[PDB]
Amino acid sequence: GYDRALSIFSPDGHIFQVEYALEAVKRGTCAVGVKGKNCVVLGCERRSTLKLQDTRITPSKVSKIDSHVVLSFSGLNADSRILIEKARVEAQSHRLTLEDPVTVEYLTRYVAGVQQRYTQSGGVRPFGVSTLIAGFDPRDDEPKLYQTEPSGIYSSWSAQTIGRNSKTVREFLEKNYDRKEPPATVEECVKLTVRSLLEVVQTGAKNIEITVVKPDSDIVALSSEEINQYVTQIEQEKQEQ
Amino acid sequence: DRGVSTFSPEGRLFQVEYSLEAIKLGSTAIGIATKEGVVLGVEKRATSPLLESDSIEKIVEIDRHIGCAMSGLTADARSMIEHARTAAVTHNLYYDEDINVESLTQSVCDLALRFGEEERLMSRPFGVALLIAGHDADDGYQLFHAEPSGTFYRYNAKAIGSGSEGAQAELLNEWHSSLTLKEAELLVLKILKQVMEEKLDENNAQLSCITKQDGFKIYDNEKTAELIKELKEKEAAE
Amino acid sequence: QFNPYGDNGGTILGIAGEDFAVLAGDTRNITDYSINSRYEPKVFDCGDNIVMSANGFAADGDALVKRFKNSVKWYHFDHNDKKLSINSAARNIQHLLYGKRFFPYYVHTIIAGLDEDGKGAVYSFDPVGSYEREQCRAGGAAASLIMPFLDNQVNFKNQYEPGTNGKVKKPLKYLSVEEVIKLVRDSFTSATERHIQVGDGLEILIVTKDGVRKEFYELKRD
Amino acid sequence: TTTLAFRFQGGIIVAVDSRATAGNWVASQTVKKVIEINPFLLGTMAGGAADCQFWETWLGSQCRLHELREKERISVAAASKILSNLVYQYKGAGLSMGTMICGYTRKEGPTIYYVDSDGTRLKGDIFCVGSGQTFAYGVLDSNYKWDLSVEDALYLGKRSILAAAHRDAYSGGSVNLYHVTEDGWIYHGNHDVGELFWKVKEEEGSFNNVIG
Amino acid sequence: TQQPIVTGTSVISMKYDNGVIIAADNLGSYGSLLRFNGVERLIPVGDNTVVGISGDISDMQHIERLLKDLVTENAYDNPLADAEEALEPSYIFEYLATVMYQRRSKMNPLWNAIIVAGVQSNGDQFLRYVNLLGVTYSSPTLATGFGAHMANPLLRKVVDRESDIPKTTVQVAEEAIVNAMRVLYYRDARSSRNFSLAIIDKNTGLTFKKNLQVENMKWDFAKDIKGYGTQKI
Amino acid sequence: MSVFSPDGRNFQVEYAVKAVENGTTSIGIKCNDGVVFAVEKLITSKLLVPQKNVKIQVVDRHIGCVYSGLIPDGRHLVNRGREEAASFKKLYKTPIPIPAFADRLGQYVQAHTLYNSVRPFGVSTIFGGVDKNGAHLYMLEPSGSYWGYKGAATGKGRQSAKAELEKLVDHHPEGLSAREAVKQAAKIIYLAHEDNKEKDFELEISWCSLSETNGLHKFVKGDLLQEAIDFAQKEIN
Amino acid sequence: RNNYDGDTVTFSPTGRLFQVEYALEAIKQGSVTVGLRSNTHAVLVALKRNADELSSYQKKIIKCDEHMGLSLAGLAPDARVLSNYLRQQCNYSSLVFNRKLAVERAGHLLCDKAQKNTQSYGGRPYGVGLLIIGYDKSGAHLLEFQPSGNVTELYGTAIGARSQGAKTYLERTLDTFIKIDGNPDELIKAGVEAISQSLRDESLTVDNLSIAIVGKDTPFTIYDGEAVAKYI
Amino acid sequence: MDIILGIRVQDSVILASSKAVTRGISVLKDSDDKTRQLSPHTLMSFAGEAGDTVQFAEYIQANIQLYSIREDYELSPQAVSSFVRQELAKSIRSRRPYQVNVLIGGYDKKKNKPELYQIDYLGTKVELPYGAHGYSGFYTFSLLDHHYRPDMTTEEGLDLLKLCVQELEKRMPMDFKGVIVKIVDKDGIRQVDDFQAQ
Amino acid sequence: SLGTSIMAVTFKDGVILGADSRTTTGAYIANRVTDKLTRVHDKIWCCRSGSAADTQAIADIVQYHLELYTSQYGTPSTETAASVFKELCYENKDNLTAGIIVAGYDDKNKGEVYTIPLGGSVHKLPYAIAGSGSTFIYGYCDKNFRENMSKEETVDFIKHSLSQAIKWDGSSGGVIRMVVLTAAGVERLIFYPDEYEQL
């Protein structure tokens, strides 16, 4: 019975609840994504460490929607769980009726669809979540990366980041990413991604996690040491200069 | 605070008026009608270079004989297209014929005032406007402006968004009873080039038409690119 | 148990000409061996140069006619007084009939008029909405006694030019509105003799670009 | 009723008859049993005339919406499933249909799905459905080669409907032929059975025991 | 769904030069038990319409009470209730016919056979039939139950067709009816001797006659009929 | 609404009363075998069709109602009135007794003062008729309060009228034949028109009497309406 | 006003529904339209507004049945919602009673449908004014409908901005037009003049002007453009 | 019914499943695969009422795949059956009951054991060494009871099935157009494509 | 079920209801002393026939209605009471087997009798007879009923008419009950076999 209109216009023409919802995304731990010639990479900052937490079981920022698509987010963790569940269902329902998994643009659209319905339905507030959704369409090699906001607006990106200090790292990438010369290798790509975060992280491989998505449902999460080979390399490369 | 479907003392709906304010902030979009077709064009406005400039669709197909361009909180327009597309296909199914463009528009507009607290589950009005352009065999080529106020108007040409008054004025002057399709294509391009902050090019602008002949087509970045350099040359000489 | 259906008999006929079309039905409404009315009209002008008849269980037929007429009326309100094309009308009816797919309208229904090129058009339906544009169609009690006749005198089926060996069929020439009317009456007077549910009267509705005109012929009352 | 449809290097041949009876009463022989769902897709009619026609016409409306939302041609796999899944919602309520959903997409080649009102959905190469089916499968199974020329395939198809139209009381009128290519279907016309029969017995020498 | 229990029998009618005449016996049968003899099955609405009803009486009683409410409600916020905007036969009928059809359609019929006789604002004779299935029809003569089979043959010989209506007078037509009522009393085991009759006329208006009887019968030949074949006494 | 102010009253009702007071006057007079209803209809313009904006409503066949205040609310109440009078009858057979009816409205109006998401009625309704045992005149405030009456009036010229009524009660304790009450009311509408005499006004009178209307409710029209208008014009001039 | 005009379910200390009054303002700022009638016809003349020279003129007239239709001023969508409601009642009265709906009665209904929005919470009062004409079993009729729930029957009247001028001209013309019985084109001119009296800035022409008439033998029809040229 | 056979050997689980689909008088398809892969190490053969049969299997598969992804884990071949049984239990007092019979053949990677489960349309689950649905057991069980050995090599399993299929081909009236055979083991699910004249 | 032998006769001072006493299920007499006279209001009673379960559940629900009615509109007419019975019997024709006679006393109307047979129809009458045993006394009752009878005469008329019904109808038997309704209150009578058989 509770349908009070929580998301509403104000004289200037804004819906303050959608904006306060972005304010919550700017609070979140940074998230970034970049696509190479033949791969897509996702990076994510994580507070400190922390010397007394348990990492194996505790929710890791990158989630799998299907075997060929993943999702990353900044903002309210509790909220993102809701978008991940719904998204994972629409994935398997798509398979069940269309006999083909989702395209990255289709899934991305569905999520942004939810995000929007919560800016226009009564008794509910928008999601304090913005996302990077990345993968490969089935029987396709060309890489895909998309971003969705609490507005319900979505769009594709060669590189993008969201969350705290996102502005710094977008400015970094706006300089360090050539549309004509996109990171030809996995390695070449994972490097740029580790570096984009190293403006905002304040330590090496402790906070950074990387997930590498390559065609035909090929996804792997780099374990700290491999990330620390890019960290070891980046601090001495900048040095010489 | 004070209710959603509340009236001001001037007899306006605060929300519908505050909705229109959100539209003024939207990307520009122009539409021009002719005896040869209707042309719609838009300003993509990519907030960063990195953003893949063609995943920005502000012109969509509603049916083979109807297209529509949008301005403002574009996210809100998803529901409206979905309904418009359904409405048009449904009608085809019940009558084995195309829906008249007015009818299609009037259906979209109904949707717009269904908000509040029939069975109007929707908390606020849409925060987006639509130019709707198509062709039926009764009233040939047509353009409509569909506000979140539920009202629509037919236009021989019209702009919505950031540069609308400057472009409407410029449209008032430039539009004549007998422009060709290609003249109209150019005025859209010209008038967009005036009001857009950026230097109009094939990646921050898109152009489309709807002819009785081939229905609704969105001009690919190549074809529009040639029309831009067709302007620079048409303008250069006087 | 209560049976919700019944049969009021009657026979109806639809024929399409080059620039015209007819929809004729007998006038006699019945129940078993009783006559309910020697004059109860079965064919209706529904506006937009559409005529129709829903033969069979006249209650379900009345219901159906009322609905379609009203569908027209709303098509005008809802779509800026646009004229309802005969095909568009045929489609609408399929939706009406199929709405009651699991509790059918107990009727065989037919409409006539002119397509959008002004050519004579007839459509025939199922009780559940299967429709097909037709050239010539009888429906009702006597439909069996009429169809073979028309196949023969309208479509010249089984005829050949004399001395042709049986190798060259009769030319399929285009009939008038007045040769068609002869066949319509000759069909109904023939049926009248062999079917106990066909008699009294024969009212015909003719549709040409000039509009919807009507004619009526007395029929044997036994 | 005799409906059939096969897959070959040239795509798909589809062929049906025209007769519709009400017991022993031949009500019409001018019945479209090939449903032109849309320019790339076809469906045959067996069992419920309205049921097939109505629901497949609807399929066309569902396939349109799909293309609008995904800016892409619908797979035959997914268009058949739409019809199938709907039908399954109504299972037990009396719907009658036995139809082939035919189409040729870039992605999947020429595909044919059988969908009946029991919910059954099956991908196949050759399907005949109806009162004439047993007859048509005989002719079909004898001359079926993946390498029939478009032109023979059309004939094998037409001939099969003829074979059934002849024996089946319930099949007759004419034959409607269709050739489905990746670029869409092409109507290969109507053929009065009466006339076809004679012509065919003379070209082929078959129907020997039929005096004439 | 249901089945009739207390039932009304033949309701007959026809039209003449100025108006219409309708009649129905005054019996509420209970199977073969002739249980209730004071039943009026003629229900007058306005001064211009009369509704004859056959079938389930429980149901009739309900129709009757719908008709009172129709009048009641027609007057509401209607300053011309008893004038231009008075209930017209065409209106009263369409309403019932609507209700009867809706009812068969909810598989829950009003188990009746109704005849609505009357005269319209512009002098026109109105007379139409409607029953449990929603089937509606009209003709110069209309009857239900046995009347359909016995009364019509007779009444039709007076008004065989439309042209005949101007030639039939009220005395010619009223005698036809009174005869048919007799013939039905002779040959319908579910009939009553007492009946009511009503005339709606464009000049005389509505005249409603209760407590009639079938008179001038012939039973004298009976005394001579003996045995069933060869018996002589 | 449904909020007591610290004084025990409900301010929203109290304001709905203001609306009523802003209203045209209407009255009721009980007579010895029925009741009479009367109302002033202001002529806003010479464009109103005289005798065509009838404000007195009939309930069932034997009850009349008249109101002052928010005309639409009034109808909305008479609509519930009709629904209620049909219900009662359908089940109980008899046409609804007046006092029973008065409570049916009294419970429903009062219902609209119990919730703060529903506004109370903006009319004061005068109604009444003839039942199984006598005549009854009732008047019903937005409060849901209602009582039987010898005479009643509500609206702008409510006292001008209550004064004229208090006299008829005193100077006529024997009774007051319907016909007399019709004229007497007409006079009271003319006198009460003094307060709100800016505009010209149209008279409207209905009556329900066992002898004159056989128990049914009817609109005093034509001749008998002229006598009434005459009778009144004499005691103004 | 602060508290009392926040919603419709609230009476001001002076007994007023402020939202209702505010919705009347939209009418007063609505483009003028006029109604007037005789004994044989009833006419609606309506001035149309436009947003631009490139804009169309928004229709102020809607048909409701074969023998009835109306004219508006205020919010268009609310006219649509009410004229659609009205289309169904006429239709219901036809379908079920084979009876044409009486003009008077349509007024009662639109009055009751509007009144519920002035009493219920969550809902706003309608924001549109309407003039309705029709030839029913008792002749020609004109009604003035107000969002408040107040419908009134008249010979003539006007609503919209500046409508006061045309209304006064009708108070005068009264005894003349009442009697334009049997004359269609004369009743239209009489209405067309009335409309001029509340005109001011511009001057009626083909695109502006819209006219409707119903009557004894004339089914309700609308005329716009070339078809109204004959009266300018 | 069609032939649904199942046999649990030492290292794996073999599932046979006829290739004929018949509608009334004509055999519509001679190459059907009455099986759905629910999870890398879990296969489900099915037989019964037309339409229901697949709707169910695809519906189950979807939920397992959804589960698999939500917990990035593979459910135990036991768990899966317990879920599948629960769904058939619901179907039984349902408005219209699914009339589908199944066999779950899985390889539990935790216990490193192959498991076979047969569950009828009523939701009657029992875990076996060799199972069968419908009349299939009537011909075959006499043979399996005799020759079956819990320590058999997969090839011994396939040999025992071959002998089962032959008897089905000899004494059973319906011509089921041969069987499709698949093995579920620690490495996954694969189809013995050479079960013709082995 | 009450199958039954019941009647209600209006006379000069008011009305008398009468009924047998036997309720059978098959041939076994479940209860041979049933009070088939049921009170829905002080001076408005009914006699029940057809399904006990039903007739009781109904009488009970009518009583309730008449009690609430009484609380707010004062006393109800025998007519208003009959109406309530019928509204229930008619609006539920499909699930009821009840044939009820309604009898009451208004001071204005004196005796009134309304019969409500299976359909749910209503018929007001001078007297009424119902139940299994009423088919046998149609002849007798009609021949001997007389309007405005003495109370003594009306009791005889009922006692005779019922004695006959009991005689022939196996489904009816026992004692003969009667309820008298006049301005002088409510009287309850009873006649044993040894008495009514000897007529």
Pair type for strands B152-154 and G209-215: unpaired
Which of E65, E69, E76 lies closest to F58 in CB terms?
E76
CA C4/CA B224 separation, integer angstroms: 66
**Of the residues E1, E72, E141, E230, which is catalytic?**
E1
CA C15/CA C10 separation, integer angstroms: 17
Pair type for strands E125-131 and E136-137: antiparallel
Q: At what angle do helices A166-176 and A186-197 cross, to 10 degrees?
A: 140
Residue H24 contacts D where some CB pair is shorter than 8 Å: no
> What b/e readout covers A68-101, taking b as 16+ CB neighbours within 10 angstroms?
bbbbbbbbbeebbeebbeebbbbbbebbbebebb
Which residues of chain E make contact with F90, given a CB cutoff of 8 A? 65
Per DSSP, helices labelled H in B96-220 are: 101-113, 164-174, 181-195
Based on DSSP, count helices (H) and strands (E) in chain A, helices before strands.
6, 10
Beta-carbon-side half-sphere exposure of residue B206 (alpha carbons within 13 Å): 23
Burial of C189: CB neighbours in 10 Å, binned 0-12, 13-18, 19+: middle
In the structure encoding, which two tokens stand for residue C135, read together? 């050239």
| Residue to substitute from G9, G34, G121, interface F, most F β-carbons within 10 A | G9
User: Are E91 and G99 inside 8 Å of each other by CB?
Assistant: yes
The alpha carbon torsion through B183, B186, B187, B189 (nearest 10 deg) reads: 160
Residue C131 contacts D where some CB pair is shorter than 8 Å: yes
- Answer whether A154's CB lies under 8 Å from A108's CB: yes
- Answer whether D46's CB lies under 8 Å from D130's CB: yes
- Count the domains in chain A: 1
> Nearest C-alpha of chain B: how many angstroms from D61?
6
* Residue G120 CB partners (closer than 8 Å, separation 6+): F118, G8, G9
DSSP state of E211: E
Q: Which chains touch A (3 or more CB pairs under 8 A)?
A: B, D, H
* Residue H106 CB partners (closer than 8 Å, separation 6+): H13, H39, H41, H42, H43, H76, H77, H78, H80, H81, H114, H115, H116, H117, H184
Domains and CATH numbers, chain G: 1-232 (3.60.20.10)
> CATH number, domain at D167?
3.60.20.10
A106 three-state secondary structure: helix
What is the distance of C-alpha E2 from the center of its chain? Answer: 23
User: Are C82 and B100 inside 8 Å of each other by CB?
Assistant: yes
User: Are E72 and F219 inside 8 Å of each other by CB?
Assistant: no
Which residue in D1, D206, D39, D7 sits closest to D122, CA to CA? Answer: D7
What method was applied to determine this entry?
X-ray
Measured over the CA atoms of residue F129, residue F131, residue F135 and residue F138, the dihedral's sign is negative
CA E62/CA A82 separation, integer angstroms: 58
Q: Helix, strand, coil shares of chain B as percentages rounded to 5?
A: 35, 25, 40
Q: Where are the beta strands (DSSP E) in chain G?
A: 33-37, 41-47, 61-65, 68-74, 128-136, 139-145, 151-154, 156-159, 209-215, 218-224
Q: Which chains touch I (3 or more CB pairs under 8 A)?
A: E, F
The letter for the amino acid at I97 is T
Q: What is the DSSP string of E63-115?
A: HHHHHHHHHHHHHTT-TTTTTTTS--HHHHHHHHHHHHHHHHHTT----EEEE
The alpha carbon torsion through B11, B16, B17, B18 (nearest 10 deg) reads: 130
Nearest CA in chain E to F52: E79
What is the distance of C-alpha G13 from the center of its chain? Answer: 32
I177 three-state secondary structure: strand
- Answer whether I175's CB lies under 8 Å from I6's CB: no
CA I141/CA I139 separation, integer angstroms: 6
Burial of F202: CB neighbours in 10 Å, binned 0-12, 13-18, 19+: middle
The CB density around residue C33, as the number of other CB atoms within 10 Å, is 8
| Residue listed under structure tokens 């047969």 | H118
Residue H96 contacts D where some CB pair is shorter than 8 Å: yes
CATH topology of domain I1-199: Glutamine Phosphoribosylpyrophosphate, subunit 1, domain 1 (3.60.20)
Q: What are phi and psi of F55, to 5 degrees?
A: -110, -15
Which of B8, B154, B171 lies closest to G22 in CB terms?
B8
CB contact residues (below 8 A), chain E span 78-97, against chain F: 79
Q: Strand pairing partners for F69? A: F123
Burial of E157: CB neighbours in 10 Å, binned 0-12, 13-18, 19+: exposed
Q: Where are the beta strands (DSSP E) in F24-122?
A: 26-31, 34-42, 57-59, 63-69
Which residue in G48, G44, G34, G43 sits closest to G205, CA to CA? Answer: G48
Burial of C202: CB neighbours in 10 Å, binned 0-12, 13-18, 19+: buried
Domains and CATH numbers, chain E: 1-233 (3.60.20.10)
In the structure encoding, which two tokens stand for residue I120, read together? 């749910």
Instruction: Write out the residue range of the structural domain in which residue A177 sits.
Output: 1-241
Which residue in H123, H64, H126, H132 sits closest to H99, CA to CA? Answer: H123
CA G67/CA D152 separation, integer angstroms: 65
The letter for the amino acid at A116 is Q
CA D45/CA D55 separation, integer angstroms: 11
The CB density around residue I194, as the number of other CB atoms within 10 Å, is 7
Nearest CA in chain C to G88: C74
Which residue in D85, D81, D110, D99 sits closest to D34, CA to CA? Answer: D99
- My answer on whether omega of the bond before C175 falls inside 30° of 0, hence cis, is no
Residue E222 contacts G where some CB pair is shorter than 8 Å: no
- Answer whether G63's CB lies under 8 Å from G229's CB: no
Homologous superfamily, domain H1-198: Aminohydrolase, N-terminal nucleophile (Ntn) domain (3.60.20.10)
| Residue listed under structure tokens 């306006």 | B12
> What b/e readout covers D190-212, taking b as 16+ CB neighbours within 10 angstroms?
ebebeebbeebeeeeeebeeeee
Cα–Cα distance list, I66 to C1, G198, I88, I99 (Å): 37, 65, 13, 19
CA H183/CA I36 separation, integer angstroms: 79
Measured over the CA atoms of residue H130, residue H133, residue H137 and residue H140, the dihedral's sign is negative
CA A141/CA A155 separation, integer angstroms: 20
In the structure encoding, which two tokens stand for residue F34, read together? 């029925």
| Residue listed under structure tokens 């659609």 | G84
Burial of A14: CB neighbours in 10 Å, binned 0-12, 13-18, 19+: middle
Region label for D28, one of left (φ > 0), alpha (ψ between -120 and 50) or beta (otherwise): beta
Which of D30, D48, D54 lies closest to C134 in CB terms?
D30
Which of C101, C132, C144 lies closest to D28 in CB terms?
C132
Residue-range domain boundaries for chain C: 1-222
Which of C102, C131, C144 lies closest to D93 in CB terms?
C102
Which residue in D152, C78, C16, G179 sits closest to B105, CA to CA? Answer: C78
CA I144/CA A6 separation, integer angstroms: 82
CA G23/CA C136 separation, integer angstroms: 60
| Residue listed under structure tokens 């059918």 | C104
Residues of D recognised as catalytic: 1
Q: Which chains touch C (3 or more CB pairs under 8 A)?
A: B, D, E, G
CA F109/CA G49 separation, integer angstroms: 44
Which of D30, D50, D93 lies closest to C130 in CB terms?
D50
* Residue E228 CB partners (closer than 8 Å, separation 6+): none
In the structure encoding, which two tokens stand for residue A92, read together? 């398997």
Measured over the CA atoms of residue B116, residue B122, residue B127 and residue B130, the dihedral's sign is negative
Cα–Cα distance list, C203 to B100, B121, C200, E14 (Å): 37, 53, 10, 24
| Residue listed under structure tokens 């009036």 | F153
Residue G157 contacts F where some CB pair is shorter than 8 Å: yes
Which residue in G79, G197, G195, G66 sits closest to G130, CA to CA? Answer: G79
- Count the domains in chain D: 1
CA B44/CA B54 separation, integer angstroms: 8
Residue E62 contacts I where some CB pair is shorter than 8 Å: yes
Cα–Cα distance list, D6 to D15, D129, D130, D138 (Å): 9, 12, 15, 14
CA I190/CA I175 separation, integer angstroms: 7
Residue F60 contacts E where some CB pair is shorter than 8 Å: yes
- Answer whether I184's CB lies under 8 Å from I42's CB: no
Q: Where are the beta strands (DSSP E) in chain I?
A: 6-10, 15-19, 23-25, 28-31, 37-41, 44-47, 100-106, 110-116, 123-125, 127-130, 176-182, 185-191
* Residue C117 CB partners (closer than 8 Å, separation 6+): none
In the structure encoding, which two tokens stand for residue B221, read together? 């970045």
Region label for B37, one of left (φ > 0), alpha (ψ between -120 and 50) or beta (otherwise): left
* Residue I177 CB partners (closer than 8 Å, separation 6+): I18, I19, I20, I21, I35, I36, I37, I188, I189, I190
User: Kindly report the CA angle at C140 between C139 and C142, in degrees rounded to 5?
Assistant: 100
CA E119/CA E126 separation, integer angstroms: 5
Cα–Cα distance list, B146 to A171, B105, B153, G116, I104 (Å): 38, 7, 7, 29, 71
User: Are C70 and G91 inside 8 Å of each other by CB?
Assistant: yes
- Answer whether D175's CB lies under 8 Å from D190's CB: yes
Per DSSP, helices labelled H in B117-156 are: none
CA D100/CA D108 separation, integer angstroms: 16
The alpha carbon torsion through F191, F196, F200, F202 (nearest 10 deg) reads: -60
Measured over the CA atoms of residue B162, residue B168, residue B170 and residue B171, the dihedral's sign is positive
Which residue in F122, F19, F116, F114 sits closest to F77, CA to CA? Answer: F122
DSSP state of B200: -
Nearest CA in chain C to B137: C82
> CATH number, domain at B137?
3.60.20.10
User: Kindly report the CA angle at D84 between D82 and D89, in degrees rounded to 5?
Assistant: 100
Instruction: Write out the residue range of the structural domain in which residue D123 sits.
Output: 1-212
Residue F206 contacts E where some CB pair is shorter than 8 Å: no
Q: Strand pairing partners for H106? A: H42, H115
Helix (H) or strand (E) holding B230: helix B221-236
| Residue listed under structure tokens 């006959």 | I164
> Rg for chain I (alpha carbons), in Å?
16
CA A195/CA F163 separation, integer angstroms: 95
- Count the domains in chain B: 1
* D49 annotated ligand binder: yes
Longest dimension (CA), chain H: 48
- Answer whether I199's CB lies under 8 Å from I160's CB: yes
User: Kindly report the CA angle at G112 between G110 and G118, in degrees rounded to 5?
Assistant: 105
E156 three-state secondary structure: helix
Helix (H) or strand (E) holding A143: none
* Residue F204 CB partners (closer than 8 Å, separation 6+): F38, F39, F41, F54, F55, F56, F219
As its CATH architecture, domain C1-222 has 4-Layer Sandwich (3.60)
User: Are A92 and H59 inside 8 Å of each other by CB?
Assistant: no
In the structure encoding, which two tokens stand for residue A80, read together? 């993102």
Q: What are phi and psi of F205, to 5 degrees?
A: -135, 130
Which residue in D116, D86, D76, D77 sits closest to D99, CA to CA? Answer: D116
CA I2/CA G3 separation, integer angstroms: 68
Residue E2 contacts I where some CB pair is shorter than 8 Å: yes
Nearest CA in chain H to D119: H51
Q: Which chains touch H (3 or more CB pairs under 8 A)?
A: A, D
Residue D150 contacts C where some CB pair is shorter than 8 Å: no
CA A64/CA A161 separation, integer angstroms: 19
Beta-carbon-side half-sphere exposure of residue F35 (alpha carbons within 13 Å): 30
Q: Are 3 or more Cβ–Cβ pairs between B and F shorter than 8 Å?
A: no
Measured over the CA atoms of residue C134, residue C138, residue C144 and residue C149, the dihedral's sign is negative
CA D83/CA D98 separation, integer angstroms: 12
Domains and CATH numbers, chain F: 1-237 (3.60.20.10)
DSSP state of D97: B
Strand order in the sheet with B59-63: B59-63, B66-72, B128-135, B141-146, B152-154
Q: Where are the beta strands (DSSP E) in G148-217?
A: 151-154, 156-159, 209-215
> Rg for chain A (alpha carbons), in Å?
18
CA A211/CA G135 separation, integer angstroms: 77
Region label for B48, one of left (φ > 0), alpha (ψ between -120 and 50) or beta (otherwise): beta
Which residues of chain E make contact with I118, given a CB cutoff of 8 A? 5-6
G147 three-state secondary structure: coil
In the structure encoding, which two tokens stand for residue G37, read together? 């009638």
Which residue in B101, B108, B104 sits closest to B128, CA to CA? Answer: B108
Cα–Cα distance list, B152 to A13, B148, B177, D78 (Å): 21, 9, 22, 38
Cα–Cα distance list, G35 to D70, G38, G71, G75 (Å): 52, 11, 8, 19
User: Are D120 and H50 inside 8 Å of each other by CB?
Assistant: yes
Which residues of chain B make contact with D58, given a CB cutoff of 8 A? 93
CA H27/CA H34 separation, integer angstroms: 15
Beta-carbon-side half-sphere exposure of residue E111 (alpha carbons within 13 Å): 22
3-class DSSP string for chain H: CCCEEEEECCCCEEEEEECCEEECCEEEECCCCCEEEEECCEEEEEEECCCHHHHHHHHHHHHHHHHHHHCCCCCCHHHHHHHHHHHHHHHHCCCCCCCEEEEEEEEECCCCEEEEEEECCCCCEEEECEEEECCHHHHHHHHHHHHCCCCCCHHHHHHHHHHHHHHHHHHCCCCCCCEEEEEEECCEEEEECCCCCC
Q: Where are the beta strands (DSSP E) in F110-210?
A: 123-131, 134-140, 146-148, 151-154, 201-209
Beta-carbon-side half-sphere exposure of residue C123 (alpha carbons within 13 Å): 23
In the structure encoding, which two tokens stand for residue A165, read together? 């200090």
Residue G99 contacts E where some CB pair is shorter than 8 Å: yes
| Residue listed under structure tokens 């199944």 | H102
